C-alpha atoms as a PDB file:
ATOM      1  CA  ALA A   1    -122.191 -16.654  69.212  1.00  0.00           C
ATOM      2  CA  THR A   2    -118.994 -14.811  68.268  1.00  0.00           C
ATOM      3  CA  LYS A   3    -116.846 -16.769  65.786  1.00  0.00           C
ATOM      4  CA  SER A   4    -113.053 -16.628  65.519  1.00  0.00           C
ATOM      5  CA  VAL A   5    -110.448 -17.522  62.936  1.00  0.00           C
ATOM      6  CA  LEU A   6    -106.654 -17.318  63.177  1.00  0.00           C
ATOM      7  CA  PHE A   7    -104.585 -17.312  59.978  1.00  0.00           C
ATOM      8  CA  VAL A   8    -101.063 -18.737  60.391  1.00  0.00           C
ATOM      9  CA  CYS A   9     -97.730 -18.768  58.545  1.00  0.00           C
ATOM     10  CA  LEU A  10     -94.102 -19.200  59.545  1.00  0.00           C
ATOM     11  CA  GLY A  11     -93.284 -15.531  59.934  1.00  0.00           C
ATOM     12  CA  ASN A  12     -96.646 -13.695  60.070  1.00  0.00           C
ATOM     13  CA  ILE A  13     -95.449 -10.947  57.693  1.00  0.00           C
ATOM     14  CA  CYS A  14     -96.383 -12.277  54.207  1.00  0.00           C
ATOM     15  CA  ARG A  15     -99.274 -14.758  53.667  1.00  0.00           C
ATOM     16  CA  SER A  16    -101.180 -14.798  56.991  1.00  0.00           C
ATOM     17  CA  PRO A  17    -101.528 -11.014  57.366  1.00  0.00           C
ATOM     18  CA  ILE A  18    -102.887 -10.917  53.816  1.00  0.00           C
ATOM     19  CA  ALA A  19    -105.432 -13.663  54.497  1.00  0.00           C
ATOM     20  CA  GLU A  20    -106.414 -11.939  57.736  1.00  0.00           C
ATOM     21  CA  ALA A  21    -106.937  -8.554  56.073  1.00  0.00           C
ATOM     22  CA  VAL A  22    -108.800 -10.203  53.209  1.00  0.00           C
ATOM     23  CA  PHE A  23    -111.174 -11.931  55.656  1.00  0.00           C
ATOM     24  CA  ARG A  24    -111.696  -8.779  57.796  1.00  0.00           C
ATOM     25  CA  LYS A  25    -112.743  -7.037  54.569  1.00  0.00           C
ATOM     26  CA  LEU A  26    -115.205  -9.826  53.680  1.00  0.00           C
ATOM     27  CA  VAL A  27    -116.979  -9.785  57.037  1.00  0.00           C
ATOM     28  CA  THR A  28    -116.805  -6.006  57.361  1.00  0.00           C
ATOM     29  CA  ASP A  29    -118.494  -5.517  53.968  1.00  0.00           C
ATOM     30  CA  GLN A  30    -121.227  -8.026  54.941  1.00  0.00           C
ATOM     31  CA  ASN A  31    -121.905  -6.067  58.136  1.00  0.00           C
ATOM     32  CA  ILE A  32    -120.785  -8.947  60.356  1.00  0.00           C
ATOM     33  CA  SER A  33    -117.281  -8.002  61.543  1.00  0.00           C
ATOM     34  CA  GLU A  34    -118.882  -7.518  64.966  1.00  0.00           C
ATOM     35  CA  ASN A  35    -119.611 -11.242  64.963  1.00  0.00           C
ATOM     36  CA  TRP A  36    -116.060 -12.287  64.108  1.00  0.00           C
ATOM     37  CA  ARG A  37    -112.796 -12.319  65.988  1.00  0.00           C
ATOM     38  CA  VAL A  38    -110.119 -12.227  63.265  1.00  0.00           C
ATOM     39  CA  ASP A  39    -106.345 -12.424  63.649  1.00  0.00           C
ATOM     40  CA  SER A  40    -103.079 -13.860  62.330  1.00  0.00           C
ATOM     41  CA  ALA A  41     -99.929 -15.257  63.909  1.00  0.00           C
ATOM     42  CA  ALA A  42     -96.585 -16.981  63.187  1.00  0.00           C
ATOM     43  CA  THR A  43     -95.319 -20.450  64.087  1.00  0.00           C
ATOM     44  CA  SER A  44     -91.827 -18.979  64.712  1.00  0.00           C
ATOM     45  CA  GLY A  45     -90.272 -16.018  66.500  1.00  0.00           C
ATOM     46  CA  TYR A  46     -88.281 -14.482  63.631  1.00  0.00           C
ATOM     47  CA  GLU A  47     -90.437 -11.477  62.751  1.00  0.00           C
ATOM     48  CA  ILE A  48     -92.030 -10.643  66.058  1.00  0.00           C
ATOM     49  CA  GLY A  49     -93.023  -6.964  66.192  1.00  0.00           C
ATOM     50  CA  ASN A  50     -92.561  -6.484  62.449  1.00  0.00           C
ATOM     51  CA  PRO A  51     -95.169  -5.034  60.057  1.00  0.00           C
ATOM     52  CA  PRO A  52     -96.215  -7.039  56.976  1.00  0.00           C
ATOM     53  CA  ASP A  53     -93.766  -7.461  54.084  1.00  0.00           C
ATOM     54  CA  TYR A  54     -93.805  -4.157  52.177  1.00  0.00           C
ATOM     55  CA  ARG A  55     -94.432  -6.011  48.901  1.00  0.00           C
ATOM     56  CA  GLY A  56     -97.561  -7.508  50.424  1.00  0.00           C
ATOM     57  CA  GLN A  57     -98.589  -4.061  51.645  1.00  0.00           C
ATOM     58  CA  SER A  58     -98.165  -2.662  48.115  1.00  0.00           C
ATOM     59  CA  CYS A  59    -100.242  -5.499  46.742  1.00  0.00           C
ATOM     60  CA  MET A  60    -102.969  -4.846  49.316  1.00  0.00           C
ATOM     61  CA  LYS A  61    -102.998  -1.096  48.555  1.00  0.00           C
ATOM     62  CA  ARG A  62    -103.605  -1.820  44.834  1.00  0.00           C
ATOM     63  CA  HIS A  63    -106.758  -3.635  45.879  1.00  0.00           C
ATOM     64  CA  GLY A  64    -107.559  -0.844  48.314  1.00  0.00           C
ATOM     65  CA  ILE A  65    -107.402  -3.124  51.367  1.00  0.00           C
ATOM     66  CA  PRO A  66    -106.044  -1.650  54.608  1.00  0.00           C
ATOM     67  CA  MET A  67    -103.459  -3.985  56.124  1.00  0.00           C
ATOM     68  CA  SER A  68    -102.344  -3.106  59.611  1.00  0.00           C
ATOM     69  CA  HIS A  69    -100.731  -5.834  61.707  1.00  0.00           C
ATOM     70  CA  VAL A  70     -97.845  -6.364  64.132  1.00  0.00           C
ATOM     71  CA  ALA A  71     -96.302  -9.823  63.716  1.00  0.00           C
ATOM     72  CA  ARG A  72     -96.819 -12.124  66.700  1.00  0.00           C
ATOM     73  CA  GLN A  73     -96.149 -15.768  67.465  1.00  0.00           C
ATOM     74  CA  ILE A  74     -98.957 -18.206  68.137  1.00  0.00           C
ATOM     75  CA  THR A  75     -99.524 -19.096  71.820  1.00  0.00           C
ATOM     76  CA  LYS A  76    -100.957 -22.036  73.722  1.00  0.00           C
ATOM     77  CA  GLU A  77    -103.987 -19.851  74.409  1.00  0.00           C
ATOM     78  CA  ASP A  78    -104.794 -19.488  70.699  1.00  0.00           C
ATOM     79  CA  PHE A  79    -105.619 -23.218  70.527  1.00  0.00           C
ATOM     80  CA  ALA A  80    -108.199 -22.799  73.297  1.00  0.00           C
ATOM     81  CA  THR A  81    -109.822 -19.605  72.020  1.00  0.00           C
ATOM     82  CA  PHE A  82    -110.006 -19.895  68.241  1.00  0.00           C
ATOM     83  CA  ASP A  83    -112.678 -21.929  66.472  1.00  0.00           C
ATOM     84  CA  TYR A  84    -110.459 -22.149  63.369  1.00  0.00           C
ATOM     85  CA  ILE A  85    -106.736 -21.996  62.707  1.00  0.00           C
ATOM     86  CA  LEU A  86    -106.052 -21.877  59.000  1.00  0.00           C
ATOM     87  CA  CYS A  87    -102.496 -22.153  57.724  1.00  0.00           C
ATOM     88  CA  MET A  88    -100.706 -21.857  54.407  1.00  0.00           C
ATOM     89  CA  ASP A  89     -98.612 -24.945  53.788  1.00  0.00           C
ATOM     90  CA  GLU A  90     -97.749 -28.426  55.020  1.00  0.00           C
ATOM     91  CA  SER A  91     -94.872 -27.419  57.312  1.00  0.00           C
ATOM     92  CA  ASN A  92     -97.180 -24.846  58.993  1.00  0.00           C
ATOM     93  CA  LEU A  93     -99.707 -27.602  59.515  1.00  0.00           C
ATOM     94  CA  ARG A  94     -97.051 -29.950  60.915  1.00  0.00           C
ATOM     95  CA  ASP A  95     -95.867 -27.256  63.284  1.00  0.00           C
ATOM     96  CA  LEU A  96     -99.361 -26.373  64.455  1.00  0.00           C
ATOM     97  CA  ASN A  97    -100.266 -30.010  64.991  1.00  0.00           C
ATOM     98  CA  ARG A  98     -97.086 -30.310  67.017  1.00  0.00           C
ATOM     99  CA  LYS A  99     -97.971 -27.368  69.285  1.00  0.00           C
ATOM    100  CA  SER A 100    -101.615 -28.448  69.498  1.00  0.00           C
ATOM    101  CA  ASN A 101    -100.522 -31.699  71.167  1.00  0.00           C
ATOM    102  CA  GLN A 102     -98.699 -29.830  73.966  1.00  0.00           C
ATOM    103  CA  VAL A 103    -101.914 -28.199  75.051  1.00  0.00           C
ATOM    104  CA  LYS A 104    -104.782 -29.329  77.308  1.00  0.00           C
ATOM    105  CA  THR A 105    -107.614 -27.586  75.472  1.00  0.00           C
ATOM    106  CA  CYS A 106    -107.632 -27.546  71.678  1.00  0.00           C
ATOM    107  CA  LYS A 107    -110.919 -26.058  70.500  1.00  0.00           C
ATOM    108  CA  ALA A 108    -109.412 -25.000  67.165  1.00  0.00           C
ATOM    109  CA  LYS A 109    -109.934 -26.923  63.956  1.00  0.00           C
ATOM    110  CA  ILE A 110    -106.490 -26.750  62.305  1.00  0.00           C
ATOM    111  CA  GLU A 111    -106.623 -26.821  58.484  1.00  0.00           C
ATOM    112  CA  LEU A 112    -104.943 -25.553  55.367  1.00  0.00           C
ATOM    113  CA  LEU A 113    -106.707 -22.412  54.171  1.00  0.00           C
ATOM    114  CA  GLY A 114    -106.327 -23.887  50.681  1.00  0.00           C
ATOM    115  CA  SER A 115    -108.548 -26.836  51.539  1.00  0.00           C
ATOM    116  CA  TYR A 116    -111.399 -24.340  50.994  1.00  0.00           C
ATOM    117  CA  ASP A 117    -110.309 -23.363  47.496  1.00  0.00           C
ATOM    118  CA  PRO A 118    -113.018 -24.099  44.897  1.00  0.00           C
ATOM    119  CA  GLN A 119    -110.088 -24.450  42.472  1.00  0.00           C
ATOM    120  CA  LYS A 120    -108.417 -27.144  44.605  1.00  0.00           C
ATOM    121  CA  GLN A 121    -105.104 -25.315  45.126  1.00  0.00           C
ATOM    122  CA  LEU A 122    -104.180 -26.890  48.461  1.00  0.00           C
ATOM    123  CA  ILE A 123    -101.008 -24.942  49.200  1.00  0.00           C
ATOM    124  CA  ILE A 124    -100.625 -21.192  49.410  1.00  0.00           C
ATOM    125  CA  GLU A 125     -97.010 -20.861  48.302  1.00  0.00           C
ATOM    126  CA  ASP A 126     -94.603 -18.562  50.090  1.00  0.00           C
ATOM    127  CA  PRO A 127     -94.107 -15.485  47.838  1.00  0.00           C
ATOM    128  CA  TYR A 128     -91.097 -14.344  49.895  1.00  0.00           C
ATOM    129  CA  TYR A 129     -88.477 -15.376  47.294  1.00  0.00           C
ATOM    130  CA  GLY A 130     -90.717 -14.293  44.444  1.00  0.00           C
ATOM    131  CA  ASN A 131     -91.973 -11.112  42.815  1.00  0.00           C
ATOM    132  CA  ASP A 132     -95.115  -8.950  42.731  1.00  0.00           C
ATOM    133  CA  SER A 133     -96.940 -11.538  40.616  1.00  0.00           C
ATOM    134  CA  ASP A 134     -96.348 -14.099  43.367  1.00  0.00           C
ATOM    135  CA  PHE A 135     -97.881 -11.758  45.916  1.00  0.00           C
ATOM    136  CA  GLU A 136    -100.822 -11.260  43.515  1.00  0.00           C
ATOM    137  CA  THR A 137    -101.368 -15.026  43.271  1.00  0.00           C
ATOM    138  CA  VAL A 138    -101.384 -15.280  47.077  1.00  0.00           C
ATOM    139  CA  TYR A 139    -103.949 -12.497  47.313  1.00  0.00           C
ATOM    140  CA  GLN A 140    -106.214 -14.176  44.724  1.00  0.00           C
ATOM    141  CA  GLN A 141    -105.955 -17.525  46.540  1.00  0.00           C
ATOM    142  CA  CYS A 142    -106.875 -15.815  49.821  1.00  0.00           C
ATOM    143  CA  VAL A 143    -109.974 -14.207  48.276  1.00  0.00           C
ATOM    144  CA  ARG A 144    -111.144 -17.574  46.893  1.00  0.00           C
ATOM    145  CA  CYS A 145    -110.460 -19.512  50.097  1.00  0.00           C
ATOM    146  CA  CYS A 146    -111.761 -16.891  52.559  1.00  0.00           C
ATOM    147  CA  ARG A 147    -114.971 -16.417  50.561  1.00  0.00           C
ATOM    148  CA  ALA A 148    -115.490 -20.181  50.604  1.00  0.00           C
ATOM    149  CA  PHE A 149    -114.590 -20.583  54.299  1.00  0.00           C
ATOM    150  CA  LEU A 150    -116.954 -17.778  55.263  1.00  0.00           C
ATOM    151  CA  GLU A 151    -119.838 -19.495  53.407  1.00  0.00           C
ATOM    152  CA  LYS A 152    -119.361 -22.970  54.851  1.00  0.00           C
ATOM    153  CA  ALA A 153    -116.794 -24.214  57.372  1.00  0.00           C
ATOM    154  CA  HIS A 154    -115.599 -27.840  57.392  1.00  0.00           C
END
């Protein structure tokens, strides 16, 4: 049974592509990437076609993680095909819940990625108006949450 997770933010250039690349590293290094469909997407259309924020890329390169992604907006189909849709903050969640109610088939469990944090940091804050340290915090949160989600899904 092939499992799937979709990481979601507003733009799909900062937080979600990081979480996605973090997770694809986890499963790849445990020999199970073949068992996982992994992706990320945006609630809005602002960044469509764009690569990840360069600051996020630089952060990912310091941790030696390849991050290669073209921003895309979430579709009605994503709700039917993904087992899990994990977002970053409360407005993401509100948006996703909104879209999920326009759809016939919602297989996806929609949750904050942070609800998996062992350290109870619910929200993964947007680093967009911040600095490198803010990107680093996001990365560390993703590692914690992804590692926990991979072990045991709600």
